[PDB]
Paper text:
[name], the bacterial homolog of hDAT, has provided key insights that have improved our understanding of Na+/substrate-coupled transport in the neurotransmitter sodium symporter (NSS) family. In the NSS superfamily, which includes DAT and [name], thermodynamic coupling of substrate and Na+ -co-transport occurs via an alternating access mechanism that comprises the opening and closing of the IC and EC gates. R445 is aligned to R375 in [name], which forms the R375-E6 salt-bridge as part of the IC gate. Previous studies of [name] conformational dynamics have shown that the network of interactions between the N-terminus (residues R5, E6, W8), TM6/IL3 (Y265, Y268), TM8 (D369), and TM9 (R375) are key to occluding the IC vestibule in the outward-facing occluded (OO) state.
First, we determined the effects of substitutions at the [name] residue corresponding to R445 of hDAT, R375 in [name]: [name] [name], [name] R375D, and [name] R375C. In all structures (superimposed), L-Ala, Na1, and Na2 (purple spheres) could be modeled into their respective binding sites (left). These crystal structures showed that [name] and R375D substitutions in [name] precluded salt bridge formation between R375 and E6, and between R375 and the backbone of I184 as was also observed with Rosetta modeling in Figure 4A. In addition, K189 moved towards E6 by 3.4 Å, reducing the distance between residues K189 and E6 from 8.0 Å in [name] WT to 4.6 Å in [name] [name] (middle bottom), in agreement with Rosetta modeling. The distance between residues R5 and D369, and between residues E6 and I187, was conserved in all three structures (right bottom), as also found with Rosetta modeling. We found that both neutralizing and acidic substitutions at R375 likely promote the dissociation of the E6-R375 salt bridge (closest atom-atom distances: WT = 2.1 Å; [name] = 5.4 Å; R375D = 4.2 Å), weaken the interaction of R375 and I184 (closest atom-atom distances: WT = 2.5 Å; [name] = 6.0 Å; R375D = 4.7 Å), and decrease the thermodynamic stability of [name] (Rosetta scores: [name] = +4.4 REU; R375D = +5.6 REU relative to WT). The substitution [name] increased the probability of an IF conformation only in the Apo (black trace) and Na+/Leu states (blue trace) (right). We have previously shown that other mutations associated with neuropsychiatric disorders (i.e. ΔV269) that disrupt this IC network also bias [name] to an IF conformer, impairing transporter function. It is important to note that in the Apo conformation [name] does not alter [name] IC gate to the extent of R375D. Finally, in the EC gate, [name] promotes longer-distance components sampled in the Apo, Na+, and Na+/Leu states.
Residue numbers in the entry: 5 to 132, 135 to 511
């Protein structure tokens, strides 16, 4: 089996797994529309009671499976619990990352396309003022790029440039993945993560210098870091905070598990996993939190910045921030640096999100790495046309896989590993080879607190929020639901074929 060459490479690959579009696009929007500091108390609590313990669990399951030649949850779940239902539940550890890849890589390709256009100066001219005179040309810029519908049809018409840039983006992902773990993902992470840190630090510094009649960057830091215990009893904030923790740490994606399956059997995962987790949180709250929100608050004030964050998921990062930069000297180049930052953040995460299907094809169907990567890329590339051309298909997949799926799968993998497999054997397996030991209090968190916390959360989710999405949606969401259900059936069939290969073997 392939293995990570160096410990630093391991940590930077896992940190690039986690540090992605979630840190720089998702976190600012979720924090802003949930009260800023009101969001941070649940967020910190979720990191300590959900994020960290699940990170260790996924590292442990991955390393455990990899020692036996399996890096994905169909096989690993069965190793933990020899029951055919374990294999079926394990399909989610391929389905979730595949579905997320199908829209994540497309969004990643937007950042490359914008980076190219901002570098070359093919960007809107804001007229020398009225805020909508500033925002409108950049709103139109994004809408023409992805082809937002202008009539009543729920159809997207992305520009030719956007489509070609998606092909290029897929080619870049393949170019890394096809070289494998140590020579591909690991080598690239050692280049991309330092670049990523430097770009973000420079952007934070430039943003902190922003000052207008409406405020300063410091006003945004105060909005984000001022506790607000009013919302502390609002269910929606807790669901938001825990969803962000899952998404940003790549938990419930099967992707931490697959990366860890290339960790040598006796190599530490306690300190490694903790470091990857803490690195992501620093990049999230310090770097991600210090760019978009402080810039928007400085130029528009808090109330308008909040309204902007509530406008959409891409309004802050693809419209508002480039519009703000356009009002500064060298602002188009600053836009390029922002979108190049997002591209590298996305690329290091999308190679991680596609490696689970690659590992399954290699491990269970015994494909060569080349064939496993190309077939995975073909599946993602083909399926992405749904996200490219059907309005709000992106949203539906991000919901079932990227939002509900990861939380459900996180609870599932914990129950399998810490209840069925055995809490004491799971605890033994986590700490084996540890450079440090997991704090003892965390045994009771993982066995009792984390599962109760996630179960309560999933209950209120399905009772007080899901019915709206099941009855209050446009009919075209059934196209996307139909297709991703088909994907689950196709993957279940591949698990079936992998079973019968190992029986005829
Ligand atoms: C083989 C993939 C199955 C679906 C066929 C997709 C064909 C893509 O079609 C292309 O989309 C671009 C972006 O809007 C347009 O610029 C081009 O006019 C169009 O040819
Ligand atoms: C970004 C690296 C090169 C790939 C992008 C080049 C493909 C852009 O293609 C261009 O799109 C526009 C469509 O009207 C027009 O400029 C031209 O028809 C076409 O050459
Ligand atoms: C299945 C994925 C969406 C396919 C729509 C992309 C093409 C949109 O553009 C279409 O290109 C077609 C040929 O490529 C032509 O038949 C259409 O007349 C033309 O409008
Ligand atoms: C995977 C594709 C999801 C659905 C996207 C359909 C894009 C439709 O695209 C266009 O629609 C026109 C009607 O307005 C038709 O004349 C053309 O067939 C087609 O080019
Ligand atoms: C959700 C629980 C948050 C965990 C906070 C970190 C706990 C570290 O706390 C330490 O735990 C060690 C147990 O091994 C003990 O040796 C120490 O007495 C204690 O200080
Ligand atoms: Na992240
Ligand atoms: Na990343």
């Amino acid at each position: 089996r392939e293995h990570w060459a160096t410990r630093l490479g391991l940590i930077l690959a896992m940190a690039g797994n986690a540090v992605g579009l979630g840190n720089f696009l998702r976190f600012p929007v979720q924090a802003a529309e949930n009260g800023g500091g009101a969001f941070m108390i649940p967020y910190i609590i979720a990191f300590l009671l959900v994020g960290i313990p699940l990170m260790w669990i996924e590292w442990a399951m991955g390393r455990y499976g990899g020692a036996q030649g399996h890096g994905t949850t169909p096989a690993i779940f069965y190793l933990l619990w020899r029951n055919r239902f374990a294999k079926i539940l394990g399909v989610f550890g391929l389905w979730i990352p595949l579905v997320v890849a199908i829209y994540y890589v497309y969004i990643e390709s937007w950042t490359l396309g914008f980076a190219i256009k901002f570098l070359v100066g093919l960007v809107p001219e804001p007229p020398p003022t009225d805020p909508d005179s500033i925002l409108r040309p950049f709103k139109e810029f994004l809408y023409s790029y992805i082809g937002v519908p202008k009539g009543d049809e729920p159809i997207l018409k992305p520009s030719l440039f956007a489509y070609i840039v998606f092909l290029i983006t897929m080619f870049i992902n393949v170019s890394i993945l096809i070289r494998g773990i140590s020579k591909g993902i690991e080598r690239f992470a050692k280049i991309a993560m330092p670049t990523l840190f430097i770009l973000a630090v420079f952007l934070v510094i430039r943003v902190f210098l922003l000052e207008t009649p409406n405020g300063t960057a410091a006003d945004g830091l105060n909005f984000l870091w001022t506790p607000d215990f009013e919302k502390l009893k609002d269910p929606g904030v807790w669901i938001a905070a825990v969803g962000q923790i899952f998404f940003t740490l790549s938990l419930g994606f099967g992707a931490i598990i697959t990366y860890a399956s290339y960790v040598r059997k006796d190599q530490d995962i306690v300190l490694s996993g903790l470091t990857a987790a803490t690195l992501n949180e620093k990049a999230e709250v310090i770097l991600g939190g210090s760019i978009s929100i402080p810039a928007a608050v400085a130029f528009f004030g808090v109330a308008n910045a909040v309204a902007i964050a509530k406008a959409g998921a891409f309004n802050l990062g693809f419209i508002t921030l480039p519009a703000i930069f356009s009002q500064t000297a060298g602002g188009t180049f600053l836009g390029f640096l922002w979108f190049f930052l997002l591209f590298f953040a996305g690329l290091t995460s999308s190679i991680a999100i596609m490696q689970p299907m690659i590992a399954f094809l290699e491990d269970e169907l015994k494909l060569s790495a080349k064939h496993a990567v190309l077939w995975t890329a073909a599946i993602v590339f083909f399926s992405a046309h749904l996200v490219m051309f059907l309005n709000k298909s992106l949203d539906e997949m991000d919901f079932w896989a990227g939002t509900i799926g990861v939380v459900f799968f996180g609870l599932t993998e914990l129950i399998i590993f810490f209840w069925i497999f055995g809490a004491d054997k799971a605890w033994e397996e986590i700490n084996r080879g540890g450079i440090i030991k997991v704090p003892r209090i965390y045994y009771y968190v993982m066995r009792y607190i984390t599962p109760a916390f996630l179960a309560v959360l999933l209950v209120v989710w399905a009772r007080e929020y899901i019915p709206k999405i099941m009855e209050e949606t446009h009919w075209t969401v059934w196209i996307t639901r139909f297709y991703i259900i088909g994907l689950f059936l196709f993957l279940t069939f591949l698990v079936f074929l992998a079973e019968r290969r190992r029986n005829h073997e």
